[PDB]
Amino acid sequence: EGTFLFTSESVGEGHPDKICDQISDAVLDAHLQQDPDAKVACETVAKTGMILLAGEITSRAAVDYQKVVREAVKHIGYDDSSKGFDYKTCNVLVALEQQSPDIAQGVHLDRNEEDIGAGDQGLMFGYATDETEECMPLTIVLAHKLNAKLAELRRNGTLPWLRPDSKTQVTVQYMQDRGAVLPIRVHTIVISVQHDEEVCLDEMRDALKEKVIKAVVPAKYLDEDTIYHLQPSGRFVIGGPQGDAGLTGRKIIVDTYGGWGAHGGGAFSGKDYTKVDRSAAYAARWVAKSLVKGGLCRRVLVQVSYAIGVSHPLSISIFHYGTSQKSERELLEIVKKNFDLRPGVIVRDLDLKKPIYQRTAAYGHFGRDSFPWEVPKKLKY
Amino acid sequence: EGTFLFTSESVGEGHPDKICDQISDAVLDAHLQQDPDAKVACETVAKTGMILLAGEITSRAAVDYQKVVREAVKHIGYDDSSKGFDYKTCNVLVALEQQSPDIAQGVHLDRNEEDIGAGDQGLMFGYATDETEECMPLTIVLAHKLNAKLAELRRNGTLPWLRPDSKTQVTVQYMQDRGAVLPIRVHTIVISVQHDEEVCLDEMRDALKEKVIKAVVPAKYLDEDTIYHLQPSGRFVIGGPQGDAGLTGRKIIVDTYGGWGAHGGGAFSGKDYTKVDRSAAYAARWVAKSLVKGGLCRRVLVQVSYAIGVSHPLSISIFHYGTSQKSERELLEIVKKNFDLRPGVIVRDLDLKKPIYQRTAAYGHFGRDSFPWEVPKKLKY
Amino acid sequence: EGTFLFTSESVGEGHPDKICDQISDAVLDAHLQQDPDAKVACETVAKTGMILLAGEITSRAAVDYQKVVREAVKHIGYDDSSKGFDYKTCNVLVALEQQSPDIAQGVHLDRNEEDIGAGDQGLMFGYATDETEECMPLTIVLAHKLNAKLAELRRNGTLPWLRPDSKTQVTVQYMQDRGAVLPIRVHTIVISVQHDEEVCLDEMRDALKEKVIKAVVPAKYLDEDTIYHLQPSGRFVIGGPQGDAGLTGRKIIVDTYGGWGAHGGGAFSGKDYTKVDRSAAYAARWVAKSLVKGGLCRRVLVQVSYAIGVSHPLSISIFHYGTSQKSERELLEIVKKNFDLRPGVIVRDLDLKKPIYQRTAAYGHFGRDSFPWEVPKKLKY
Amino acid sequence: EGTFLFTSESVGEGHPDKICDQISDAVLDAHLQQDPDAKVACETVAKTGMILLAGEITSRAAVDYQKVVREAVKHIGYDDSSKGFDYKTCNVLVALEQQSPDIAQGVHLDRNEEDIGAGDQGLMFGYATDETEECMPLTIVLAHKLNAKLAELRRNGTLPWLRPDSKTQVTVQYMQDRGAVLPIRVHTIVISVQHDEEVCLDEMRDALKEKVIKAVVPAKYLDEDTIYHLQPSGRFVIGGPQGDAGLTGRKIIVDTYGGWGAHGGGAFSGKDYTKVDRSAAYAARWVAKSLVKGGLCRRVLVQVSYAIGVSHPLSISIFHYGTSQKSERELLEIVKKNFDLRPGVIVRDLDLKKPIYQRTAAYGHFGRDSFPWEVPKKLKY
Ligand SMILES: C[S@@+](CC[C@H](N)C(=O)[O-])C[C@H]1O[C@@H](n2cnc3c(N)ncnc32)[C@H](O)[C@@H]1O
Ligand SMILES: C[S@@+](CC[C@H](N)C(=O)[O-])C[C@H]1O[C@@H](n2cnc3c(N)ncnc32)[C@H](O)[C@@H]1O
Ligand SMILES: C[S@@+](CC[C@H](N)C(=O)[O-])C[C@H]1O[C@@H](n2cnc3c(N)ncnc32)[C@H](O)[C@@H]1O
Ligand SMILES: C[S@@+](CC[C@H](N)C(=O)[O-])C[C@H]1O[C@@H](n2cnc3c(N)ncnc32)[C@H](O)[C@@H]1O
Ligand SMILES: [K+]
Ligand SMILES: [K+]
Ligand SMILES: [K+]
Ligand SMILES: [K+]
Ligand SMILES: [K+]
Ligand SMILES: [K+]
Ligand SMILES: [K+]
Ligand SMILES: [K+]
Ligand SMILES: [Mg+2]
Ligand SMILES: [Mg+2]
Ligand SMILES: [Mg+2]
Ligand SMILES: [Mg+2]
Ligand SMILES: [Mg+2]
Ligand SMILES: [Mg+2]
Ligand SMILES: [Mg+2]
Ligand SMILES: [Mg+2]
């Protein structure tokens, strides 16, 4: 009684959509290394043998797109035609133009940096939950860690049949507690991972349980009733872009909260700080996690929204799930007194000209590595 | 006291991402017209002068991609280089391969149709709210209608300076009422729309208020405090793919609930019914709207999830926001007794081999035109 | 005294331009297998990881371009990323539209087949020389045979370090004899061939002399003065499209007479019989070889030309180098009495709807395998 | 008696192949403006809505390919979707990598500039004929001038129905005179030119005769027997890349001697001086024209050939058609005493690092504007 299921997924570094996110952010970082004020909107598309870059960049940097793309693919692990994709020999196509001058004049031309307009309209959410120390849902934390474990065991050679393309999915049974949520047990785990031709299904399923799941998921969460769907398709030799086209910004729930919270629809990768889809979502995460680590909430959702060309957010909303003694109105007032959500101030607070974006583009943007948006702000009230 | 803001956005038919969604679904419909069992996973990318199709199709149809793409762009209204894009003269590139045989064998090969596996893993949500007759959030309903009004006034020649690329955003002030939400007033409206070189800002802003906003939004919602951001960038001559690259599946919140509810991350357009991202999200909407129209809830969120190759959902969850006398456990039991969420049963219930998908690919997939997922199921309990 | 040098080159099946010619003709043959009246103008471009098809096809055939392209690349031998290109994993992009209706109406619409117009304007030459039995210049015959020998030794595994991309060049010293030419000796041979990383230059140069040159070139032509440039660049590991972009119709002298004779500029591959660039050049070869095998000339050049939409050639010219007792005017009259050079008659005489074109697209179109244009017509005069 | 026909063609600036040549050379010039030692091998492909650049460039220049391509297309005149192509709105795709290091090390790395190796193997020809002052065949001179006249009348607005895509073809009746050739009369003229929808065939044919042919071709060459094929297809509204795919290096006979002389197969455009296809063909033209203007020959063909990595030509041959009192052996000795045909010396003599290449890429590379290869060298003997 009072229990429910919730499911989240994650994907690996070689999932084709995630390849695109990583490449887009490799391009962004390459520009930022030379020009901290680069305007970047780089979409990547991946299909058999092809990486296409399409979008808009205005920058003083000189970037060798061939080299940057190929290095990103190399890092992921696609280095031979036997794996379905090879950084050495794939096609790299570039369709990158300047930023529209109409956008530039309306957003940033001649504006004081603190008073730059949002680079687009849109809405964004931040979320935090005290169910884990890092203030993330357990479902997606576990899903990410399963993909990370696959990559680890691939790279260290202990499961050399593994390839870079993987997906995981975790269903947890929760109890609720005055609006907060309490994990009880893992109900179902899915793992699918690309593999070499020679390994059999039974060898894979045994390894996935023993060397992946048991290594990652605490035994206290696994019991006789847990359902395992390990290599449920039965065969996954074809993978990466050869198996499924990839695009930037097609894993936005994997990138964020795994179905928990909410999403405003904007993708992160390939975008500089003036694109509030990224900067304001990072800031909203920072606000949410500041409220939870500050002891004001156990769980909270923050919405913000913007108009192109306008600095200040159009709206800010706080939803605390009943997990605060303060009203949502009071929390909103605390937020407004402690945060300035103009993009030209977020950039300073969160150090958003620094070329660290490729590191964000797999395993989620939140809940790890003490990025600036993960370090709570101390609140005055 | 008790009030909050919420913001949602929509985009027009000529927004570059939406162009891609429409093209992807034009391709799907073209295949389904000849082969109801076509397996389609068609991604579209749009940039200056270019439509690229990339993905996987296994079908008995013979489809003229050149023709289908160009006709979709023609419908949208991009028919001259003065508008930034022309169906007659753009490049159409095709990188479409067969569906992976490894996927096919794991999903649908040799399986009874009712027992086809999900075409992928993933999670999906359905949502319904009694705040409007069509059981959609007012914020996004209004946002969509503003874009539809722009297209209407473009097509009828009364505002001939309009071009197809538009975005809108609506912030509503709400009151809550026992978990349900009650719209009070429109707080802020944003409209940005591509325009010809000759029309001035003041002419546009006057028209957008008088002929667009007032035509769509009830006066009772607009007052002296409402904020209007009309052509806030000041100039939007460059637009469509020339101004911003488009991709399929980059408007998934516009396609669904505008930030309300939740999203599992999967895109709809370009996918046949075996891709549960679409079919199970449609079914989840159908469940949610059935619960609200059936009088069981005022507002409800439904989660479902799947594993590739497995027919039955892995999990089902119901969240009623406190708006039912029945427990969430009781509602879940009603759902399980009344719905079969296998993809090979959803296809029959929702008629998902019918080539009506292009019609879904602008102005949201939900809350309009009495598609099968909008017709409540009568529940037995 | 009276001697001169002449040089011709050839390239192998994996030279990037020749890859394109072969793919274009694989596409043509695929169409002709289903629709003998297909209108085909298929250009191919090759670069790292990419085959692009661009051009115009109007056909009743259903052709799987992915499959046809990949099979052609497989035949050539590019089957692994270690070789720089892999048919399994490369990108195939398609930008093929219908034939222009304006062309169609002016060329073939509603016209009796014998009276179809030329598909374009242009000029074409045929050439024949009695210096070899097959009526080809010795320089290019030898150059082709050197590339064929490389491919043979690659395919049979005796030189497993060889890759498909090769070039050869042969300089012969000739004497003249009343307008005819008499080979004396080979002055210089060049061979460059892509190779694996592990083989050293000395091993390659020894093999190229002993196993390639000596196997192909009669010893009577090689002496102490012959110059050998074997792997003259010193290193050729990177090759195929990765080393150099390829295009259809960039080897038109290799395809024909090696610098001897003349050329009107039109490419052969990827074109159906209505494109007189191919059909009329084949017919001109047939005329030239008929004059030499008929005993009228020892050496002869034939020019023809056409206007788009017009059936009969605009001009015909015969140049016999002084090697006939008959005047050029008399030979022209014999040609006109014995040949009908309308494209809709050439197609019947030379069987040009038959899908044998891929076989023409390496090692020259002339002087081998008794194609119809190589079988002399018996002349009446 | 003693007369014969000869035909040559030319194409206009907007013919799709010529568009590609011009773009390739615009790219070369852009690089040379910043880096005189740029290594450039830029192929261009054009089809509906698309310019693709593919090839190899190693340069210190920073070139904005978008801008350079679009400016070249603008110059040609494709500036509106009504014309079938628009520089403002077409797709520009870039697939340009570095020059292969294996090539670089074998050709130019660490070599004294005069002693740089040829950038490839190949053969090249130069030709000159005293039949015109500029030492070019009359057939192609006239063909070029007809296309130039079309462009002139398009640009000055007197025939505003003209579009940039055109082709011409001229057949001249000649007499021979001791190996030299003497034009007598124009036998046939073809002109095809893209046109707007509204102009009728009779208006076009009248204009083409009166305003184009009569303006260009001396009346003494036109008589009652001359055949005119003016707009012979009847309709040519669709044109440019939309009507026919273009590629660099598909007009190599138009670029040179119109079927006269010979050709070694290599294309000119998009290549720096180390590519002997261009530099040695220019030098061979210079030699030929020096022999004719020096009074040694009336007509002459020069062959040269190279091996990759080797500076000096492998072979040189002179054919004087019987038009000199000196033997061909004597002429060869004069050539060898007066010319150094190493590429690293040709570059100095012919100023081949200067960014003048786009000017060569329509209307032929020879016989006009007193380029260095058109200024005879004064010979010592
Ligand atoms: C199954 S595919 C999406 C549907 C696909 N585009 C189609 O044509 O049916 C989505 C992801 O699943 C994974 N995948 C690919 N092949 C698979 C297989 N044989 N078994 C399981 N998962 C697979 C990869 O991570 C891929 O990016
Ligand atoms: C502003 S753009 C996204 C950022 C962009 N890629 C860049 O390079 O900065 C997103 C959408 O805004 C709209 N847009 C384009 N140009 C605009 C302008 N000048 N003013 C307002 N909105 C514009 C179009 O709907 C476009 O698809
Ligand atoms: C040398 S490349 C043409 C020039 C080249 N595009 C560049 O960037 O310098 C022409 C042909 O030579 C051959 N080739 C490629 N790399 C070579 C090498 N390292 N040594 C010799 N020949 C090579 C291949 O057959 C190739 O298609
Ligand atoms: C006729 S096309 C080549 C054949 C063509 N690729 C096909 O699909 O049949 C070659 C050139 O002829 C010219 N051309 C195009 N359309 C034409 C027409 N309707 N009439 C005459 N010439 C035309 C253009 O200069 C074009 O580049
Ligand atoms: K968000
Ligand atoms: K996909
Ligand atoms: K969803
Ligand atoms: K974008
Ligand atoms: K020819
Ligand atoms: K090349
Ligand atoms: K030449
Ligand atoms: K063509
Ligand atoms: Mg995806
Ligand atoms: Mg957005
Ligand atoms: Mg977008
Ligand atoms: Mg998904
Ligand atoms: Mg080439
Ligand atoms: Mg031609
Ligand atoms: Mg051509
Ligand atoms: Mg060559």
Assigned token pair, C112: 């009796």
Q: Is B377 a catalytic residue?
A: no
Where does residue C271 rank: exposed (0-12), middle (13-18), buried (19+ CB within 10 A)? buried
B351: left (phi over 0), alpha (psi -120 to 50) or beta: left
Of A76, A97, A66, A9, residue with least CA distance to A241: A76
Where does residue A208 rank: exposed (0-12), middle (13-18), buried (19+ CB within 10 A)? buried
Report the distance separating Cα B279 and Cα B347, nearest Å. 7
User: H or E stretch including B150?
Assistant: helix B138-155
Instruction: Kindly list the distances between the CA atom of residue B66 and the CA atoms of B22, B30, B93, in Å, as whole numbers in the listed order.
Output: 15, 12, 8
Contact across the interface for D92 and B47, Cβ inside 8 Å:
no
User: Which 95-114 residues of chain B touch chain C by CB within 8 A?
Assistant: 95, 97-98
Residue located via tokens 């006066």 = B219
Of D286, D324, D326, D278, residue with least CA distance to D302: D286
DSSP state of C363: S
- What are the percentages of helix, strand and coil residues in chain D, rounded to 5? 35, 25, 40
Q: Is B368 a catalytic residue?
A: no
Report the distance separating Cα A78 and Cα A154, nearest Å. 12
Where does residue C103 rank: exposed (0-12), middle (13-18), buried (19+ CB within 10 A)? buried
Contact across the interface for D264 and C253, Cβ inside 8 Å:
yes
Instruction: Kindly list the distances between the CA atom of residue C128 and the CA atoms of A108, C9, C136, C319, in Å, as whole numbers in the listed order.
Output: 70, 18, 6, 11
Interface check D57 vs C, CB under 8 A: no
What does residue A17 show for φ and ψ, rounded to 5 degrees? Answer: -65, -45
H helical segments located in chain D: 16-34, 65-76, 101-107, 138-155, 201-207, 214-216, 276-293, 328-338, 343-349
- D50-58 vs D39-47, strand pairing mode: antiparallel
Interface check A222 vs B, CB under 8 A: no
Report the distance separating Cα C184 and Cα B116, nearest Å. 75
Q: Is A339 a catalytic residue?
A: no
> Of the bound ligands, which one is closest to the alpha carbon of residue D245?
12
User: H or E stretch including B184?
Assistant: strand B180-195
Contact across the interface for C86 and A90, Cβ inside 8 Å:
no
Instruction: Kindly list the distances between the CA atom of residue C127 and the CA atoms of C134, C141, C284, C300, C346, in Å, as whole numbers in the listed order.
Output: 12, 14, 7, 6, 17
H helical segments located in A163-293: 201-207, 214-216, 276-293
Print burial letters for D252-274: b (CB count within 10 Å at least 16), e (below 16): bbbbbbbbbbbbbbbbbbbbbbb
Tell whether residue B121 is among the known ligand binding residues.
no
**CA B319, B173, B15, B246: dihedral to nearest 10 degrees?**
-50
Instruction: Kindly list the distances between the CA atom of residue D125 and the CA atoms of C260, D128, D256, D304, D315, in Å, as whole numbers in the listed order.
Output: 11, 10, 9, 6, 12
Print burial letters for B272-290: b (CB count within 10 Å at least 16), e (below 16): bbbbbbbbbbbbbbbbbbb
**Residue D174 β-bridge partners:** D4, D183
Contacts of C157 (CB under 8 A, 6+ apart): none
* Ligand 17 centre distance from Cα of residue C13 (Å): 13
- D50-58 vs D91-97, strand pairing mode: parallel
Of A221, A227, A215, residue with least CA distance to A189: A227
* Ligand 2 centre distance from Cα of residue B15 (Å): 9
Report the distance separating Cα B379 and Cα C328, nearest Å. 96
Contacts of B67 (CB under 8 A, 6+ apart): none
Tell whether residue D235 is among the known ligand binding residues.
yes
The minimal CB distance from B90 to the residues D49, D80, D88 is found for D49
Report yes or no: B256 and B365 within 8 Å, Cβ to Cβ: yes
Please state, as a whole number, how many other Cβ atoms lie within 10 Å of the Cβ of residue A379.
Answer: 18
Q: Which residues of C touch A47 (CB under 8 A)?
A: 91
**CA A81, A87, A90, A93: dihedral to nearest 10 degrees?**
160
Cα angle B125, B128, B134 (rounded to 5 degrees) comes to: 130
The minimal CB distance from A9 to the residues B123, B171, B254 is found for B123
* Mutation site for C-interface testing, chosen from A45, A91, A242 by largest number of C Cβ within 10 Å: A91
Report the distance separating Cα A257 and Cα A125, nearest Å. 10
The 3-state DSSP class for residue C129 equals strand
Contact across the interface for A93 and D94, Cβ inside 8 Å:
yes
Fold held by D11-114+239-275: GMP Synthetase; Chain A, domain 3 (3.30.300)
- C227-230 vs B180-195, strand pairing mode: unpaired
Q: Which residues of B touch D49 (CB under 8 A)?
A: 49-50, 89-92
* Ligand 17 centre distance from Cα of residue C188 (Å): 22
Report yes or no: A87 and A70 within 8 Å, Cβ to Cβ: yes
Report yes or no: D99 and D56 within 8 Å, Cβ to Cβ: yes
* Ligand 19 centre distance from Cα of residue D167 (Å): 11
Report the distance separating Cα D334 and Cα D300, nearest Å. 14
* Mutation site for D-interface testing, chosen from A57, A59, A93 by largest number of D Cβ within 10 Å: A93
Report the distance separating Cα A187 and Cα A164, nearest Å. 26
Where does residue B2 rank: exposed (0-12), middle (13-18), buried (19+ CB within 10 A)? exposed
Report the distance separating Cα C85 and Cα A89, nearest Å. 6
Q: Fold match between D1-10+138-238 and D115-137+276-380?
A: yes
* Ligand 4 centre distance from Cα of residue D244 (Å): 6
Report the interhelical angle of D16-34 vs D65-76 (nearest 10°).
130
Report the interhelical angle of C328-338 vs C276-293 (nearest 10°).
120
Assigned token pair, D215: 């303006």
- The closest residue, in CA terms, to atom 5 on ligand 4 is D244
Interface check B93 vs C, CB under 8 A: yes
Interface check D260 vs C, CB under 8 A: yes
B121 lines ligand 1 (CB under 6 A): no
Please state, as a whole number, how many other Cβ atoms lie within 10 Å of the Cβ of residue D327.
Answer: 13
Q: Is B333 a catalytic residue?
A: no
Terminal C-alpha separation, chain A: 38
Rg of chain A over Cα atoms, rounded to whole angstroms, equals 21
Report yes or no: C111 and C95 within 8 Å, Cβ to Cβ: no
The domain D115-137+276-380 having CATH identifier 3.30.300.10: the answer here is: yes
Rounded to the nearest angstrom, the minimum Cα separation between C131 and chain D is 19
Where does residue A330 rank: exposed (0-12), middle (13-18), buried (19+ CB within 10 A)? middle
Contacts of D173 (CB under 8 A, 6+ apart): D3, D4, D5, D183, D184, D185, D186, D187
What does residue A83 show for φ and ψ, rounded to 5 degrees? Answer: -90, -5
Of A292, A312, A287, residue with least CA distance to A302: A287
Atom of ligand 1 nearest to the CA of A167: 25
Q: Reading across the β-sheet that carries D227-230, which strands appear in turn? A: D3-11, D162-177, D180-195, D227-230
Report yes or no: A239 and B109 within 8 Å, Cβ to Cβ: no
What does residue D285 show for φ and ψ, rounded to 5 degrees? Answer: -60, -45
Report the distance separating Cα B153 and Cα B155, nearest Å. 5
C-chain residue closest to A240, CA distance:
C89
C-chain residue closest to D244, CA distance:
C55
Instruction: Kindly list the distances between the CA atom of residue A263 and the CA atoms of A252, A358, C206, in Å, as whole numbers in the listed order.
Output: 8, 21, 67
Contact across the interface for C232 and D308, Cβ inside 8 Å:
yes
Terminal C-alpha separation, chain B: 38
Assigned token pair, D151: 């462009």
Rounded to the nearest angstrom, the minimum Cα separation between D244 and chain A is 23
Report the distance separating Cα D23 and Cα D37, nearest Å. 19
Contacts of A127 (CB under 8 A, 6+ apart): A256, A257, A260, A261, A262, A285, A288, A300, A301, A302
Contact across the interface for D93 and A93, Cβ inside 8 Å:
yes
Long-range interactions of C364-370: CB distance < 8 A, separation 24+ = C364/C10, C364/C136, C364/C140, C364/C144, C364/C254, C364/C255, C364/C256, C365/C255, C365/C256, C365/C268, C365/C281, C365/C282, C365/C285, C366/C136, C366/C256, C366/C257, C366/C285, C367/C132, C367/C134, C367/C135, C367/C136, C367/C141, C368/C134
Report yes or no: B24 and B252 within 8 Å, Cβ to Cβ: no
Interface check D82 vs A, CB under 8 A: no
Assigned token pair, D149: 């006249």
Structure-solving method:
X-ray
H helical segments located in chain C: 16-34, 65-76, 101-107, 138-155, 201-207, 214-216, 276-293, 328-338, 343-349
What DSSP string runs through B204-263? HHHHIIIIIIHHHS-GGG--TT-EEEESTTS---S-GGGTS-EETTS-TTTTTTTTSS--
Alpha carbon of residue B55 to chain centroid:
20
- For D2-15, the three-class secondary structure string (H helix, E strand, C coil) is CEEEEEEEEECCCC
Interface check D214 vs B, CB under 8 A: no
Report the distance separating Cα C168 and Cα C165, nearest Å. 11
Interface check C229 vs D, CB under 8 A: yes
The 3-state DSSP class for residue C183 equals strand
Q: Which of C28, C42, C99, C103 to mutate to test the pocket of ligand 4 (most atoms within 8 A of CB)?
A: C103
Please state the domain extents for chain D. 1-10+138-238, 11-114+239-275, 115-137+276-380
Report the distance separating Cα C9 and Cα C96, nearest Å. 32
Report yes or no: D229 and C313 within 8 Å, Cβ to Cβ: no
How far is it between the farthest Cα atoms of chain B?
65
Contacts of A50 (CB under 8 A, 6+ apart): A90, A91, A92, A93, A241, B54, B95, C49, C50, C91, C93
Contacts of A207 (CB under 8 A, 6+ apart): A159
Rounded to the nearest angstrom, the minimum Cα separation between D307 and chain B is 39
Report the distance separating Cα C343 and Cα C333, nearest Å. 20
Atom of ligand 1 nearest to the CA of B104: 9
Instruction: Kindly list the distances between the CA atom of residue A311 and the CA atoms of A117, A274, A277, A344, B307, in Å, as whole numbers in the listed order.
Output: 4, 10, 14, 8, 43
- For D50-79, the three-class secondary structure string (H helix, E strand, C coil) is EEEEEEEEECCCCCCHHHHHHHHHHHHCCE
Report the distance separating Cα B207 and Cα B213, nearest Å. 9
Fold held by B1-10+138-238: GMP Synthetase; Chain A, domain 3 (3.30.300)
* Ligand 16 centre distance from Cα of residue B270 (Å): 13
- C180-195 vs C227-230, strand pairing mode: parallel
Report yes or no: A375 and A22 within 8 Å, Cβ to Cβ: no
Rg of chain C over Cα atoms, rounded to whole angstroms, equals 21
User: H or E stretch including D85?
Assistant: strand D85-86
Of D91, D374, D123, D362, residue with least CA distance to D248: D362
Which value in Å is the resolution of this experimental model?
A: 1.1
Interface check D47 vs B, CB under 8 A: yes
Report the distance separating Cα C258 and Cα D181, nearest Å. 25
Report the distance separating Cα D274 and Cα D118, nearest Å. 6
Tell whether residue C319 is among the known ligand binding residues.
no
Of A109, A102, A97, A92, residue with least CA distance to A41: A97
Contacts of D87 (CB under 8 A, 6+ apart): D69, D70, D71, D72, D73, D74, D78, D79
Report the distance separating Cα B54 and Cα B27, nearest Å. 11
Rg of chain B over Cα atoms, rounded to whole angstroms, equals 21
